[PDB]
Amino acid sequence: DLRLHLLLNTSVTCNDGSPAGYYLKESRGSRRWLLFLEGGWYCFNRENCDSRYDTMRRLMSSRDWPRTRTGTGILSSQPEENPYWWNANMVFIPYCSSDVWSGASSKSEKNEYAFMGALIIQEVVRELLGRGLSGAKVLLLAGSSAGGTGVLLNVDRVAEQLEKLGYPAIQVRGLADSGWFLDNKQYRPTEAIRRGIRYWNGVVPERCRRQFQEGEEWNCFFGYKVYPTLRSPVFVVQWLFDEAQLTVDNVHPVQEGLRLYIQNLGRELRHTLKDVPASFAPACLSHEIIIRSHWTDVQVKGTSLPRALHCWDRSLHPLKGCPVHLVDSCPWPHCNPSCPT
Ligand SMILES: CCc1noc(C)c1C(=O)Nc1cc(C)on1
Numbered sequence: 001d002l003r004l005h006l007l008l009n010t011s012v013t014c015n016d017g018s019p020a021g022y023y024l025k026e027s028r029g030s031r032r033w034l035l036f037l038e039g040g041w042y043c044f045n046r047e048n049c050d051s052r053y054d055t056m057r058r059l060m061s062s063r064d065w066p067r068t069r070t071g072t073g074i075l076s077s078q079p080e081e082n083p084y085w086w087n088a089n090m091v092f093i094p095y096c097s098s099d100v101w102s103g104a105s106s107k108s109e110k111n112e113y114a115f116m117g118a119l120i121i122q123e124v125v126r127e128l129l130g131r132g133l134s135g136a137k138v139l140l141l142a143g144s145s146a147g148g149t150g151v152l153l154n155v156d157r158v159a160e161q162l163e164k165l166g167y168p169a170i171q172v173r174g175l176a177d178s179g180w181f182l183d184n185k186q187y188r189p190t191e192a193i194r195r196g197i198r199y200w201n202g203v204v205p206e207r208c209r210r211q212f213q214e215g216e217e218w219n220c221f222f223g224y225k226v227y228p229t230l231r232s233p234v235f236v237v238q239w240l241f242d243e244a245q246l247t248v249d250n251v252h253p254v255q256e257g258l259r260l261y262i263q264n265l266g267r268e269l270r271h272t273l274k275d276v277p278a279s280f281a282p283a284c285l286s287h288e289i290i291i292r293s294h295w296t297d298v299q300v301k302g303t304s305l306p307r308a309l310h311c312w313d314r315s316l317h318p319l320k321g322c323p324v325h326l327v328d329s330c331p332w333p334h335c336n337p338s339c340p341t
């Protein structure tokens with residue numbers, strides 16, 4: 001179990017002004033730290049956020065959070081469930097800012113809601129340094145779905161923060177799960193992100209911002225455009241036929257037009273990963289993420305994700321029998337036999 005700590009700086013808040021926080025389980029015999037960003041879509045205007053506050057309030061407020069949570073998948077401390085990092089210090093950061101972890105705007109007389117995702121990450125890091133993070137050798141910033149996009153938006157800022165605070169020896173890396181999307185044509189989204197950024201006062205990584213310039217920062221929410229600008233090592237996990245991608249594309253006995261659409265989506269996703277040396281991209285239709293208990297089951301070319309992550313660690317000290325670039329080439333969902341059911 002990971003136990004809840006509300007932030008000591010009570011000015012860093014969830015959407016409704018309640019304090020943000022983190023769940024922590026320490027492992028005093030380890031210098032590895034895993035900080036995981038929860039996902040859960042986003043909201044982009046007053047009316048849309050009001051609806052989310054009625055029926056998804058835990059994603060907007062800490063008032064009802066439980067005092068503990070169970071670590072599962074990559075957050076599990078049991079070797080049988082987590083062959084990769086079972087002995088690490090474990091941190092789960094709840095998503096209560098509804099801004100894809102991009103915001104830096106407080107509640108005020110002109111703002112009904114606070115959007116502080118980028119500042120929540122920074123304050124969690126600062127408060128952890130006094131609880132043992134100051135002695136870390138590796139800080140892995142991981143996340144799923146909106147949290148996976150959040151990794152891409154925040155990993156280099158964490159590295160810069162630690163350098164400026166005087167901790168040059170901590171190696172910052174990122175693990176982005178299910179957060180690598182395509183701004184493609186629908187079968188039958190980018191505007192919502194564009195409007196969201198203005199509503200949240202959202203921030204993007206600086207090199208990407210300088211490429212796309214004023215008004216075009218929404219481009220930096222798309223993995224294939226932001227990834228080449230990043231300096232920290234980042235491992236990308238993405239299903240070739242991701243269910244959230246297909247939902248926004250309006251895809252739900254398949255005839256020719258839809259067959260060609262789905263095959264082209266998989267080919268485009270595979271193309272965007274060709275120059276990503278650390279990646280795991282199975283040919284499956286899924287919404288499943290790396291904090292699920294059976295995350296060890298899927299394999300690409302005979303290699304599981306926990307193994308690929310271990311090979312990535314070794315590469316950062318190609319390796320015989322220890323691959324890090326694993327992208328399926330077969331062209332239809334479940335052509336990989338190990339896909340989840
Ligand atoms: C990037 C923000 C985000 N956070 O969680 C989800 C889900 C999204 C999202 O928008 N996914 C998209 C977007 C397009 C186009 O296709 N899929």
Ligand SMILES: *[C@@H]1O[C@H](CO)[C@@H](O)[C@H](O)[C@H]1NC(C)=O
Binds near residue numbers: 009011012119
């Ligand atoms: C709390 O966080 C806010 C926002 O990052 C910052 O302006 C303020 O200085 C912080 N308070 C303290 C005591 O550090």
